[PDB]
Amino acid sequence: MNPIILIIILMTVMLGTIIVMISTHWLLIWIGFEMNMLAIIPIMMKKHNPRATEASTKYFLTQSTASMLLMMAIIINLMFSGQWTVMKLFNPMASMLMTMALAMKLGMAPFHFWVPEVTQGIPLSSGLILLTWQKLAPMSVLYQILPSINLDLILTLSILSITIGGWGGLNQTQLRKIMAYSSIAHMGWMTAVLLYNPTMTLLNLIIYIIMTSTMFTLFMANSTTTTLSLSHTWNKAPIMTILVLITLLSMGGLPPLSGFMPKWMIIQEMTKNDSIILPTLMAITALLNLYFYMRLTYSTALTMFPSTNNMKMKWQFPTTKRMTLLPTMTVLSTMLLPLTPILSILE
């Protein structure tokens, strides 16, 4: 690695996602997705162990076939009414291929097989940047192509994505797989409310990306992969314990803490249309994706495991990591309950 080269690659991540945001033309959005892929690959394989090679291989194959299927949808759009305006489409087939392309892009339950496999064998910086930007970038595209989507597509993907991302995680003890399954469930959430009001979708996007950055900063303060290391960080440092407590109970979405403001406003602007059994089913699944959070919390700061020594040695040296921005993101992510008319700061 070289810091000049990584500054250039971060510049291209910013450039590709901004190009995806800004352009009124379909070719530039396709090039933005490709440049985002070409930039997000070398942050992965930051080491050279073959875990990173296999994970980046699976990721690159799925992202390449996603970009190809999206270009297929665009040229079908010009086989029908032909103009390069990124707006309402003119085909259920083109909209079908486009939603399946974006669902392979950001992950849904027919398409979720690559997400824990790519997030397991990578370092934490790569997981941070790929989760944040690869769940941020196609939501602008969805915000632009919302008027011409068959609802059965989004609804089937969203229902099945929340229930499969909830059903996963009961067997896994890798923290990256936990975070990946949580991401898949929340992508189901943030896509499920798209055809009624996109304000909730982009606001939940900002809130979940803040939560993910808090989670990954609290796992960059201490090199951890299993919950046993989380017990040892209970025994070596006291503030990380209550931080994992509060951030995990905000991932669960409980009312006094700010992880419930996304679900509750979704319930409002979903049940103002008379779908009721579908929101209460989704929120029973929101109950369902909390047990692995709960046993994680039990492993961290409620039940206490016996720790091996040499933490006697680790008591002298301070936890001398660097944090990008931890406390601001934490207190923005947690105490943000009474700012509910700050829904409209995004809209």
Partner 1 sequence: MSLVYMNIMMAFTVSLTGLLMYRSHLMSSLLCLEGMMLSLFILATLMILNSHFTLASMMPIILLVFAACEAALGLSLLVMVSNTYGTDYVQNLNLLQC
Partner 2 sequence: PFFDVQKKLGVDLDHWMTIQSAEQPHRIPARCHAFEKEWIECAHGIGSIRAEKECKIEFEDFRECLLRQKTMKRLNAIKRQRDKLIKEGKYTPPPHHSG
Partner 3 sequence: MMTYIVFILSIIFVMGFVGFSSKPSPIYGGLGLIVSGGVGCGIVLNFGGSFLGLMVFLIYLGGMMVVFGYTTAMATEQYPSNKVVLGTFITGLLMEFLMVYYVLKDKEVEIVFKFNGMGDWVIYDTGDSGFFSEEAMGIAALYSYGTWLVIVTGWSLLIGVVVIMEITRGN
Ligand X SMILES: CCCCCCCCCCCCCCCCCC(=O)OC[C@H](COP(=O)([O-])OCC[N+](C)(C)C)OC(=O)CCCCCCCCCCCCCCCCC
Binding site for partner 2 (CB under 8 A): 21-25, 27-28, 80-88, 140, 143-144, 147, 202
Nearer to partner 3, 41 or 337 (CB): 41
**Which of the choices partner 3, partner 2, ligand X, none does residue 34 contact, using the CB cut-off of 5 to 8 A by kind?**
partner 3
121/259 with CB nearer partner 1: 121
Closest approach, Cβ 69 to partner 1, in A, equals 8
Cα 206 to the center of its chain, rounded Å: 10
Contact 205, 137 (CB under 8 A): no
Binders in 54-113 for partner 3, by CB under 8 A:
93
Nearer to ligand X, 218 or 267 (CB): 267
Q: To the nearest whole angstrom, how small is the minimum distance from the Cβ of residue 7 to partner 2?
A: 23
CB 254 within 8 A of CB 260: yes
Q: Residue written as tokens 């669902």?
A: 103
Least Cβ distance, residue 338 to ligand X (angstroms): 26
Tokens of 274: 């008379």
CA distance 41 to 119: 13
How far is it, in rounded angstroms, from Cα 269 to Cα 267?
Answer: 6
Enumerate residues 6+ apart whose C-beta is below 8 A from 213. Answer: 128, 132, 324, 329
Nearest C-alpha neighbor of 317 from the set 225, 222, 217, 231: 222
Q: CB of residue 92 vs partner 3: minimum separation in angstroms?
A: 9
Please report, for residues 134, 243, 266, the alpha-carbon distance to residue 34 in angstroms, rounded to integers and kept in the order given. 12, 37, 32
Nearer to partner 2, 309 or 344 (CB): 344
5 scored as a contact of partner 3 (CB under 8 A)? yes
- H/E stretch holding 91 reads none
Q: Does 39 bind partner 3 (CB under 8 A)?
A: yes
Partner interacting with residue 8 (select from partner 3, ligand X, partner 1, none; CB below 5-8 Å by kind): partner 3
Partner from partner 3, ligand X, partner 1, none contacting 19, C-beta within 5 to 8 A by type: partner 3
**Residues in contact with ligand X by the rule CB under 6 A:** 274, 276-277, 280
Helix, strand, coil percentages in the chain from 3-state DSSP, rounded to 5: 70, 0, 30
* Binding partner at 5 among partner 3, partner 2, partner 1, none, C-beta below 5 to 8 Å by kind: partner 3
The interface partner of residue 274, options being ligand X, partner 2, partner 1, none and the CB cut-off 5 to 8 Å by kind, is ligand X
Please, which residues have CB within 8 angstroms of residue 325's CB and are 6 or more apart in sequence? Answer: 217
Backbone angles phi and psi of 99, in degrees to 5: -70, -35
Pick between residue 69 and residue 206 the one whose CB is nearest to partner 1.
69
* Nearest distance in Å: CB 55, partner 1: 7
Told to check if 31 binds partner 3 by CB under 8 A, we report yes
Run of H or E including 5: helix 3-22
Q: Name which of 251, 187, 178 is nearest 214 in CA terms.
A: 251
In angstroms, give the least distance from the CB of 313 to partner 1: 33
Residue 200 interacting entry, from partner 3, ligand X, partner 2, none, C-beta within 5 to 8 Å by type: none
By CB under 8 A, tell whether 45 contacts partner 3. Answer: yes
The tokens for 94 are: 């083109």
- Under a CB-based contact definition with an 8 Å cutoff, are residues 299 and 227 in contact? yes
Which of 277, 313 has the CB closer to ligand X?
277
Give how far Cα 6 sits from Cα of 10, 103, 129, 147, Å: 6, 29, 12, 39
Structure tokens at 291: 């047990």
Q: Which does 276 bind (CB under 5 to 8 A by kind): partner 1, ligand X, partner 3, none?
A: ligand X
Chain positions contacting partner 3, by CB under 8 A: 2, 5, 8-9, 12, 15, 19, 28, 31, 34-35, 38-39, 41-42, 45, 93
